[model samples]
Target chain A: CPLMVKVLDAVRGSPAINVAMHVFRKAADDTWEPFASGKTSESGELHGLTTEEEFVEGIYKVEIDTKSYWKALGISPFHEHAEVVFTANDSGPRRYTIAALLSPYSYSTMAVVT
Target chain B: CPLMVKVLDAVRGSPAINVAMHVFRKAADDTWEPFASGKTSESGELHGLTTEEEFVEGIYKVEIDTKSYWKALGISPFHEHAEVVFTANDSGPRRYTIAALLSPYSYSTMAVVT
Candidate 1:
């Protein structure tokens, strides 16, 4: 496994269960091409998004559909979605875990690479 | 004043000093219009980005130039910059503090409203 995702709800101070996410790799033409996608589990985690062989060097974007997550809870969110974009494997292949904290009006994303 | 920003360097475990930031508001045309800009202080904070009267109900974006901050530290960052976009003051004018945590390859943002 090369990539994993974790999500937490800042307002509730709990794991953000069942939030949807998508991973996209930057194409040569600078367009983003979809690579992987999943919804968070009971523990607010999605593991094994990609394999090392397929997760080559490139710019990647992790898009989280945060609006729906909040809407489902009967809240109106601020942003249409939350995104984390970065260049990966530029130096070498490394395992990555993207942790995101979400609120109705704000969100934060952090990466843990190992 | 209604908006403030604080930034921390996760890699260095200290405040991210001298990082540049810009604030923008969405216009009726659906384009972002510049509102304010500043550099972080020694405490990694930018205070009074806008006054409460000016910070009316609207969608806003906060852009942080993280690349230059890392480059000054003789490191290459993964993302060119980091951004936080959200709606503000729908209910009433309130003070906001946007806190960001940054690493060479990762970053996170959280908001505290008062």
Candidate 2:
């Protein structure tokens, strides 16, 4: 797997389970075409979003539907969604892990590329 | 002031200096209007992005340009830009601190609201 995601709930101090996400790749015409989508597991991880072969040098966007997560928990959140966009696999093949910490009124994201 | 920002560079393990940022407020018609803008200081902070009186109940967006910061350091980066969008002061007047961690190929953001 070339891409993975981990999400933590800052308010709950635990993994954010069942958070839905969608991945899109930028097309030649500058439009975003859907590439993959999944929900986080109990461990707050979504693995194998794409294969190394499919994930070539290009810009990608990951949209995390956080509002639903918070609303489901009976919390009124601030952000409608959390999104991460970046260029990937430009130099060579690389593994990327996106870790995000979420709160009702705030969120933080970090990327570990290796 | 009700809003502030702090940005860190994961590649250098230090504050991201001189990174430019722009702020926008979502309007009733769902358009985003420019509110404020600034650059990060030596300590990776931009204070007083908006005042309590100016920052009312509404959706806001913060755009941080990380590409230039990495390019100036002679390194090619991944993301074209980093953005944080959220609602503000729905309950009442509140203080928000948006913190972001950036790498050449990765970035994470967290919010501290009070």
Candidate 3:
């Protein structure tokens, strides 16, 4: 069971290739502990953000290295940092999917249990 | 048949309570046309954004008046504007729901067919 995510350039309807990413799970103390780190694939996908030991039902956050990603794409990011925060409930399956649709100025995320 | 949206202050998990909103549908020429304008209810809900004649399958944009909303809430808005853009496909029922989960600086939209 793992948490998965995909990044996309919604304006162009294409994958947001090669964007650096950091995934964190929030602790009860309100501090974020880094759980995983990686970058998007050529197809803009990152899988297994968490391993079995890393999976827990709580608040999780994913931060995109927007500046670096946009710089590589030769654009300026409207938001200094782009992030997705959600509560991962204790569903039967541990697999979850998140899709981040991003543009220069705006972004949105959709999540589902897989 | 209408487009409905709900606003929430994600940090507190409460209704946004009186945030102004402007919703627009994209024209084929890539221009945005204002389709509906209103404010959130005391319960942070905005319904009937589009009437029967206003419902269409296309790209739609909803802009939340962050400055005004935060002003009323006595907070600073990091983003000049908070927006949620989505593709409204021909899903038949014509009733769709968008839930905007927002913090002062960050926001995410979850849409479902109703």
Candidate 4:
């Protein structure tokens, strides 16, 4: 009924990173509409953990730009890029924070919504 | 960095389903060849847990045929299909089993690698 996603670096010493999430709303006719958009702040991501709140959920286009981010830091980039797509039903779950834990060559999302 | 991916249906009491994975091998000239392919059995997936064994890992093309699987059980399907692509760096880790838990409209993978 609910969903949470978190992205992170596979390695520890990764330079400054950010996770941008693009939430999309699909109309009854099957048309998609962009709704919420935000980027993880320097303070860091929600770590798949966030306070419960009354909010809506739907399809989202998740973009993970490791190349550009790494390029800014002047490091050897690996993959061209990585992206994840997910749908959320509600926001009143126990914890609802999503982020990216990344490494030079790989990245994954922690889907914690039960 | 390593990656893990699992595919499951979006609702329970829905029907029997399976997760099929296709791995690819890339040549130095940027050519890709089909390498390994397997499907998650009823016994369940590796569940992001297995054992520490000397194993090789790399890019994998994963296919989640939800529509076809759900159709077999004569259940109402939502998404046409769900596919996931990931890169695994190794096969020998502490516990390496990747699986997907089901719901009604969504499913995701449990990626566990260090």
Measured against the true chain A, the candidates' chain A TM-scores are: 0.96, 0.98, 0.86, 0.59
For every prediction, compared with the true complex, DockQ reads 0.38, 0.50, 0.07, 0.07
Model 2 per-residue lDDT tens digits across residues A8-114: 99888899999999999999998899999999999999997888888899999988999999999999887889988888888899999988888887677778889
- Give lDDT tens digits, candidate 1, residues A47-73: 878899999999898889898999999
lDDT pick, better of 3 and 4: 3
**What lDDT would each prediction earn against the true structure?**
0.87, 0.88, 0.73, 0.47
User: How accurate locally is residue B33 in candidate 3, as Cα lDDT from 0 to 100?
Assistant: 89
TM-score of 4: 0.43
Once superposed on the true structure, which residue ranges of model 4 sit more than 4 Å away at CA? A1-7, A14-19, A46-54, A76-80, A90-95, B1-114
Candidate 2 per-residue lDDT, tens place, B20-61, comes to: 999999988988899999999999999977776777888899
Predicted model with the maximum DockQ = 2
lDDT of 3 at B57: 74
Residue-wise C-alpha lDDT for candidate 1, range B54-102, written one tens digit per residue: 7888889899999899999999776768888777864854888888888
Which order, best to worst by lDDT? 2, 1, 3, 4
Query: Which of 1 and 2 is the better model by TM-score?
Result: 2
lDDT score of residue A80 within candidate 1: 68
Highest-scoring model, TM-score: 2
- State how far residue A92 of model 2 sits from its true place (Å): 3.6
Which structure is stronger by lDDT: 2 or 3? 2
Better of 1 and 4 by DockQ: 1
Better of 1 and 3 by DockQ: 1
